[PDB]
Amino acid sequence: QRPAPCYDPCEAVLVESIPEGLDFPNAGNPSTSQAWLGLLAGAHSSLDIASFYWTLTNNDTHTQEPSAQQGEEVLRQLQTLAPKGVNVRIAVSKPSGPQPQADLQALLQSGAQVRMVDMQKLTHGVLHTKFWVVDQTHFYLGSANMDWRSLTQVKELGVVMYNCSCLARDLTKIFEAYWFLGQAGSSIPSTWPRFYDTRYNQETPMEICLNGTPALAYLASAPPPLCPSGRTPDLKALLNVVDNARSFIYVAVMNYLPTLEFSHPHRFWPAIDDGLRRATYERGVKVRLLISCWGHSEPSMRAFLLSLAALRDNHTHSDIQVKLFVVPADEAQARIPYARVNHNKYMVTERATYIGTSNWSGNYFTETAGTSLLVTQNGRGGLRSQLEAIFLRDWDSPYSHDLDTSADSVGNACRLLAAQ
Amino acid sequence: QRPAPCYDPCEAVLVESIPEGLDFPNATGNPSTSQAWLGLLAGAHSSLDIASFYWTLTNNDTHTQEPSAQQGEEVLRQLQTLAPKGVNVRIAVSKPSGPQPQADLQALLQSGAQVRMVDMQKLTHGVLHTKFWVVDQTHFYLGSANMDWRSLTQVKELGVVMYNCSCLARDLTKIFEAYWFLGQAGSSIPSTWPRFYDTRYNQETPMEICLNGTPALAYLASAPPPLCPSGRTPDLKALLNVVDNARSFIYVAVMNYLPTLEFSHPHRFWPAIDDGLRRATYERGVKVRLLISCWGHSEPSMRAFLLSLAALRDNHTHSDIQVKLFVVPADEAQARIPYARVNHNKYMVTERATYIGTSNWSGNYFTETAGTSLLVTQNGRGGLRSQLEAIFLRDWDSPYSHDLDTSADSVGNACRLLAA
Ligand SMILES: *[C@@H]1O[C@H](CO)[C@@H](O[C@@H]2O[C@H](CO)[C@@H](O[C@@H]3O[C@H](CO[C@H]4O[C@H](CO[C@@H]5O[C@H](CO)[C@@H](O)[C@H](O)[C@@H]5O)[C@@H](O)[C@H](O[C@@H]5O[C@H](CO)[C@@H](O)[C@H](O)[C@@H]5O)[C@@H]4O)[C@@H](O)[C@H](O[C@H]4O[C@H](CO)[C@@H](O)[C@H](O)[C@@H]4O)[C@@H]3O)[C@H](O)[C@H]2NC(C)=O)[C@H](O)[C@H]1NC(C)=O
Ligand SMILES: *[C@@H]1O[C@H](CO)[C@@H](O[C@@H]2O[C@H](CO)[C@@H](O[C@@H]3O[C@H](CO[C@H]4O[C@H](CO[C@H]5O[C@H](CO)[C@@H](O)[C@H](O)[C@@H]5O)[C@@H](O)[C@H](O[C@H]5O[C@H](CO)[C@@H](O)[C@H](O)[C@@H]5O)[C@@H]4O)[C@@H](O)[C@H](O[C@H]4O[C@H](CO)[C@@H](O)[C@H](O)[C@@H]4O)[C@@H]3O)[C@H](O)[C@H]2NC(C)=O)[C@H](O)[C@H]1NC(C)=O
Ligand SMILES: *[C@@H]1O[C@H](CO)[C@@H](O[C@@H]2O[C@H](CO)[C@@H](O)[C@H](O)[C@H]2NC(C)=O)[C@H](O)[C@H]1NC(C)=O
Ligand SMILES: *[C@@H]1O[C@H](CO)[C@@H](O[C@@H]2O[C@H](CO)[C@@H](O)[C@H](O)[C@H]2NC(C)=O)[C@H](O)[C@H]1NC(C)=O
Ligand SMILES: [Mn+2]
Ligand SMILES: [Mn+2]
Ligand SMILES: [Mn+2]
Ligand SMILES: [Mn+2]
């Protein structure tokens, strides 16, 4: 009944982008930039990228920022791959309206293959997923977009899994669905062919050797129409981690909204919300929600976060806490479009790791493409402990604020704090 | 395939108990619970069915010496006259938790009334919480008032008397007959209730009645599920239908509100009603007013859940839930009366519907414990709905209603749901 184990010497590394000027005294991980350049340098056979959008250059953003150099170097290194015999396949979300695609035009000219996926037509969503699969051996999964700002001006969390071909091949099955749908005349098949199916899921995760000790790993995906036989839905994977927690649930996610956003009429979506309420009330689980805040934050989030924060009670052992993580901006940084925010999307418990591409609102689980990596591993000092340490560093930092914080005190625009 | 209409000249009267000292200047065409009950007893010629939780109609029952017990003692004296006059008196009463004297029921048995104790703890792990009277298969009382002298003079109560409505009275008797059957030695929940328990009158096809001279739709819902024969709408489904159909406002006055299965070990989260109210305000911009009672016996865990709902008020989304606590003042003399000086009302009114119940709004009342609710809709300005709305707003606007930030020192009685 249990599927075949993996014999690969899998190694996981948490990789962050830390924005220019954001300091954590006496806390270090390899950067997104360093990890990506390393993957590109080592690529010999194949590179698959699932992507939301491409702005790797100053010219793409109409800026003259020195901090765009890292993104520009990534694009220059990507351009070397197809000429040296690497099979480059890039799946990209179709943009809402007309938009120039300088990065992808450059990669096409280099010999890379590019397909735009019209998720708006197919599912009324977008291709939000961010991952790389390198030589069917290594992968990056996380929050970082193909954006120079993702390296130097926004906070990101991802994982690079090295030397893990069984899980790399499993992730490629998710990529292949995007790749298929990127073709002219494509439609959602009523039944995905057998080659898209996986044996590795919530019920029977993949047995891997992760950093020299046994672990259970699987990859969940969204949305439901893209889900072949055996593939765990992202929402099911996420709620299973919440439902199995017996001590704590720590969530760092850019946006949290228990709704189907931009819907007409508005639709309430309490799947995750009731999961967290159940955890704290039934099992006395300590919940810490670290939500990002910036000038583009949906203001409707504040009331729902205040609603969760109200469930702290010493007698029932109900204990949900909410903080807003705000990346400070100086005058120069404030001029950079869509920068100075924390893009992390992950969850860690006492027993589980969840690393995602999606924000925690309903569209990400019903219409929009996403992928998550689920790991459990008996013992201490592993991937789970490292992610918990990152969460607590951010939670305890001067960049994290209670909901009663004065908006005028936090060092960037924040739509989720009041004047008082 | 709609069922037969009722041709009876149905007349509904809202009946309240207003505790000694509780004043509403220039508000009170409502006859009292005491007045309405004495009227029903004086008119009774053939039959009286009472569903009851407990009997304490005398000072001796409560070990008190209160002049305000006189109304209860007069109700017991008038009840004792019925069986000797040839009235068939049938009393279903909840089995007590421990050994208790039953002076009132011993007196009624001596008069020739029939009494059965229903062991709901054995049958469903609940209690027989329902309060209703059916008089001559023609009139009924349904509401919050127990067979308790305190229910007349020392606690606030809300009920309805439906007069000259034999179709609906006979329909209520079918609920009574379930209690009456289960009160017999050797009883068990039948796998299927016999057809004579079934009703044609429910949420899908309510009874067409002439209510105070104009057409109305009325049905009776019941709890818990094991007592529910074919055709009978469950109380929870009836309640949630009124919430789900509201387009303007939902006004709820209920003694206790707790989105849990209370006293469960382990603790169990129960968001059925909670999510209904959140959905109403978020999806449909429904203005929700929750008027929860508070006294020294209030379960303190209610506060956090009420604060959680109150957090959903914001101008842009049109989310608008307000919570107030209704507190009956008690001086030192009033405070010595056991289990008094509290508001027992359980009802809901919207712009289009009336809900009058016997149950508090927590999970046990919809899963294990016996309850009954009357559901009425009626086209036109005014009527029963307008009268119940006027009672709600009288209580809501009164000096006895308090925001959750009110000092516990400032409400005229002990209140466990205010911080102080
Ligand atoms: C659908 O149809 C239903 C049936 O018709 C409608 O219900 C009825 O609604 C009517 C209008 O509101 C009700 O009439 C009113 O009843 C009021 C309550 O009356 C009782 O209580 C009075 C006060 O008792 C006193 O209180 C102390 C404690 O504080 C007690 O210890 C002691 O009992 C005190 O007496 C009591 O006085 C009254 O008795 C009446 O007194 C009359 C003298 O004024 C006498 O003629 C007679 O004895 C009578 O029984 C009751 O016991 C009452 O306040 C109110 O009176 C006032 O208003 C009228 C006009 O509306 C004025 O003429 C008076 O001068 C008063 O100012 C009035 O009688 C009626 O009771 C309801 N019917 C039933 C069967 O309950 C229902 O509304 C309708 N629905 C819709 C949507 O239309
Ligand atoms: C599961 O297994 C995996 C795989 O083994 C494991 O992952 C590795 O984790 C280890 C930690 O245990 C990592 O080792 C650390 O790597 C750090 C590397 O950081 C990079 O950046 C450094 C600084 O960068 C900045 O500053 C320089 C200034 O000059 C600037 O150029 C840059 O632009 C940037 O601003 C840089 O120094 C470093 O470069 C060195 O290493 C690379 C190869 O990684 C090499 O090519 C270079 O020539 C150079 O030697 C690198 O680019 C590093 O900081 C850290 O440092 C140790 O030493 C210092 C003192 O010297 C101590 O202060 C500190 O405490 C550290 O001990 C250390 O080397 C390793 O990188 C991971 N492996 C991979 C592949 O990513 C997981 O953790 C395991 N999980 C478990 C066990 O749970
Ligand atoms: C992934 O596997 C490669 C080997 O296939 C690892 O590289 C080797 O690393 C060890 C330690 O530095 C050396 O002894 C070998 O000489 C290296 N071999 C090659 C071919 O490079 C690599 O370290 C593994 N990656 C991770 C992150 O663990
Ligand atoms: C219920 O029905 C009875 C009739 O069966 C109503 O009583 C009558 O009231 C009217 C006044 O409107 C008088 O014409 C009669 O004297 C009464 N008849 C009897 C037999 O008493 C009664 O009012 C109806 N409504 C209520 C609320 O009881
Ligand atoms: Mn788990
Ligand atoms: Mn999903
Ligand atoms: Mn309705
Ligand atoms: Mn029910």
Residue numbers in the entry:
A (entry chain A): 72 to 98, 101 to 493
B (entry chain B): 72 to 98, 100 to 492
Task: Quote the paper.
PLD3 is synthesized as a type II transmembrane protein and proteolytically cleaved in lysosomes, yielding a soluble active form. The deficiency of PLD3 leads to the slowed degradation of nucleic acids in lysosomes and chronic activation of nucleic acid-specific intracellular toll-like receptors. PLD3 has a typical phospholipase fold and forms homodimers with two independent catalytic centers via a newly identified dimerization interface. While crystal structures for RNaseT2 and DNase II are available and provide important insight into the molecular details and function of both enzymes, no experimentally determined structural information is available for the 5′ exonucleases PLD3 or PLD4.
To gain insight into hPLD3 architecture, we determined the crystal structure of hPLD3 in the substrate-free (apo) form to a resolution of 1.5 Å. The asymmetric unit contained two PLD3 molecules. The two hPLD3 molecules in the asymmetric unit formed a homodimer via helices α10 and α11, with an interface area of 1042 Å2. The hPLD3 apo structure harbors a bound phosphate in the active site, which is coordinated by five direct hydrogen bonds with the HKD/HKE motif residues His201, Lys203, Asn218, His416, and water-mediated contacts of Lys418 and Asn432. In line with the mass spectrometry data, a high mannose-type sugar (Man5GlcNAc2) was well visible in the electron density at Asn284. The cysteine sulfonic acid (OCS) residue is located in a deep pocket 20 Å away from the active site and is coordinated by the side chain of Ser294, the carbonyl oxygen of Pro296 and water molecules. In the same deep cavity of OCS300, we found electron density for a large cation that was coordinated to the oxidized cysteine side chain via a water molecule. Careful evaluation of the electron density in combination with an X-ray fluorescence scan of the crystal used for data collection of the hPLD3 apo structure indicated that this density corresponds to a manganese ion.
